[PDB]
Nucleic acid binder design. Structure first.
Ligand SMILES: [Zn+2]
Length: 56
RNA sequence: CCUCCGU
């Protein structure tokens, strides 16, 4: 079963104004009520991009 | 994916 599981948080980004960033606002779509972590605009998952290295 | 800088 699933009990223990690590967490991979890759921080990145920083080019916008926190116009009175509401503690109950969304820092994604700018919607008030839901959090970015719960942004209904976010893409479905699991489905993340891959780096896929190949020469260079 | 894009706008998750707030964990
Ligand atoms: Zn949102």
């Amino acid at each position: 079963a699933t009990v223990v599981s690590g967490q991979k948080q890759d921080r990145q980004g920083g080019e916008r104004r926190r116009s009175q960033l509401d503690r109950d606002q969304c820092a994604y779509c700018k919607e008030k009520g839901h959090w970015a972590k719960d942004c209904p605009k976010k893409p479905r998952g699991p489905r993340g991009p891959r780096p896929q290295t190949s020469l260079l």
